[PDB]
Amino acid sequence: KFRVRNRIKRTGRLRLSVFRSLKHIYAQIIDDEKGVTLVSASSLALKLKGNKTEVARQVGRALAEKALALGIKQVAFDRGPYKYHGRVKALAEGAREG
Amino acid sequence: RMKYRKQQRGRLKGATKGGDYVAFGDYGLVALEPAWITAQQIEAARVAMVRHFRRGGKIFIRIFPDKPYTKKPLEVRMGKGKGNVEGYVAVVKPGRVMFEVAGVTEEQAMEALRIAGHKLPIKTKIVRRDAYDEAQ
Amino acid sequence: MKEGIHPKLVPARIICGCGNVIETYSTKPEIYVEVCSKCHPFYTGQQRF
Amino acid sequence: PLDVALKRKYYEEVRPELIRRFGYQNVWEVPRLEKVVINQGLGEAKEDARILEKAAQELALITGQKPAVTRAKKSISNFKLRKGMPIGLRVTLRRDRMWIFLEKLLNVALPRIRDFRGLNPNSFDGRGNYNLGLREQLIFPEITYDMVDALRGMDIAVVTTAETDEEARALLELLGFPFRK
Amino acid sequence: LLLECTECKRRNYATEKNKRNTPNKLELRKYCPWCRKHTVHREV
RNA sequence: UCCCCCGUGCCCAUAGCGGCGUGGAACCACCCGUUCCCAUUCCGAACACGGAAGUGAAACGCGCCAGCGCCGAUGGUACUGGGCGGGCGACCGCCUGGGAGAGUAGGUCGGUGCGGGGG
RNA sequence: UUGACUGGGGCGGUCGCCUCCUAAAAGGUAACGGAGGCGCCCAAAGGUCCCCUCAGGCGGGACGGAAAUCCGCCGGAGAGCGCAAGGGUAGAAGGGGGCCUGACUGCGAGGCCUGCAAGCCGAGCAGGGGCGAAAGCCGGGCCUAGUGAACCGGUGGUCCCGU
RNA sequence: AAAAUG
């Protein structure tokens, strides 16, 4: 089993919980200490193309505008099994860096 | 016959554990006063027990020494006693059932235990059964 | 499946009849019968009759 | 060198007889096959400049991958070598590389094994999957006699996606696994 | 061993502590000097 | 509104183990491949990328079961702030407030916010 | 000049520090009361990023004990955590790998403990760095023992003094 | 100028 929880090591509020399926990637901005979610940007549960990586971006841009819209910026990335690689949000806007 | 030992005297308060119930056997020997019973005593009783009815039934000794009884050599003061020397003992709080017999007549059984009591440094009482259990 | 670690392939695979003369494929000792059989005591008395 | 009979046959020949023989429903509820682990123990890495990364690759040839030098988990004064380092070579053939090796095994090695009568049908004994150990290292088509500088066989394990040794036993009796009933 | 690190071509000390026989000798490593910022600091 | 499912948090075993049928349209997974990214002390097993033919067998989801596990009263005592008698002593007892632990009856194969995709 | 403690003194034992217990559920708490350690060690046994998860038990396996190394289930911790014990811990403090050297310099809010003087924790600011995409973490080590005021000198260094 | 007993 993977006890990953690479997260849990999230203390500076605002979590960009991702989630790669086997076709669609979902990202989600969440507030801890007070369990609730705000910004969201799925893969095909949205629409756009059929190419993972390619999509993985236009799917992140999504969070950008969407988020910035309601006054969001500085945050920390996320997703544990994640393995910072292919899946990506390498995009402007959010000051989550990376 | 084990563990790290030469322990603290400690004391015997109320006999909140002085009062079980015949577990096996048929008749029994329950204690009335609290005390430390030297193994020397147990045997000295048990023996006379069996010995009272040569080639008889079964004897059950629920009490069991494990507490080390220390003692000084006949001098003054300087660290705990040589300890043990004489040996170990078991702690009996008024009510505990020490010995219990079975497989024999009450005339034989009852009279058997009576003797034991003389060996023990306490005051005893003899019991039958039919009492406690967990049935319905 | 990585760097100068592995070794090769080519035909060291489905090269079926790769000269069974190497020693023996599913040739002999098919796990059946070979030389003679048993000796048999008594059941074999050629002394007389 | 991509697809081999054994593999082939397994599909267009074994599956059926099995689907029937036993009687399944979902091709996955079937008796798949997926892992072979030829492992050695050797004996040591003790004195006299004992490199023994020789039979290391000797093993590679007989297979395809490079084995993993195994190390001590404990330390035993009884018979030398303790604490770490030492040796206990191992390798894991999966898919392709696996099929072939077996096919090469079940048609040249075992044959020829010293004498040979079959295999032990008790080695599974029930618990899904098999096992067996070969004494000689030169009982392989790739390796030679003027090559091996010292005997030292080993043991190989094999894994079934099936449970009951019954199944497992059938799957191999079909794949050509001989059996000293 | 009571060691200290002498920034090559100057002063300063770090006051470390090696283990000699236990693989040592030639101790030196990027430390921060007081005379401007870093150098490496040797042994001695 | 009420269903189904993919992410997530909270309560932190009454959600556990083990059984028993079900779910593939969606989702999810397993699968299809190893050219590229990157991979395993040897293995694309795991990480990873590219694809979607086949499957619900694995795994996960959802239900039912009490055999194991977990929970668990009420009563009643043990012990006990405080106060107080009897006896030479060893010890026994009352008044006034608190009050288990075991064991019994019995309970339980979850509960609950947030955001999503589908009828 | 030839110490003190000490159920008289001598003889014997001891003399500082760590950990359980005694200790009576905050701390603290005696006795020549019960029971064990320390006067070191790591240049990786330290930083950070990324991975992995134990011990056992049960089968199955060439040499092969009753654990050498393999494969398969079961096993939430009984292993591990340099050395005593204890507390803590796998949702890692454990096992492995890549880069590193913060085992930094200037400081230090606010506290713990406390007769004194000592001991302990420490966010944050500055400088100039490490690892990570990043959020971030880094002033030695899972933590508590591994230590000694002053005086007198020794080696260096430097803005100072120098009859 | 020479290495015990039965």
Next chain:
RNA sequence: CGCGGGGUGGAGCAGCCUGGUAGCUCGUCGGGCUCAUAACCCGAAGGUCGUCGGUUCAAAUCCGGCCCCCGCAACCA
């Protein structure tokens, strides 16, 4: 009661604080010399290292528990 020395093949002594190699003399055993015995000569064997366990990869060896063996003290009233 307390200190401290010591238990190793059959006898008598090493080896132990500096853990992995058990050494010496005597005697036991086999073969020679001699008419024969000694002597002398050549060649072998033989040790759970007192015990019950602890630490270690490994204990004759280091740390505790008794069992016999040996010595030294046990003083003022």
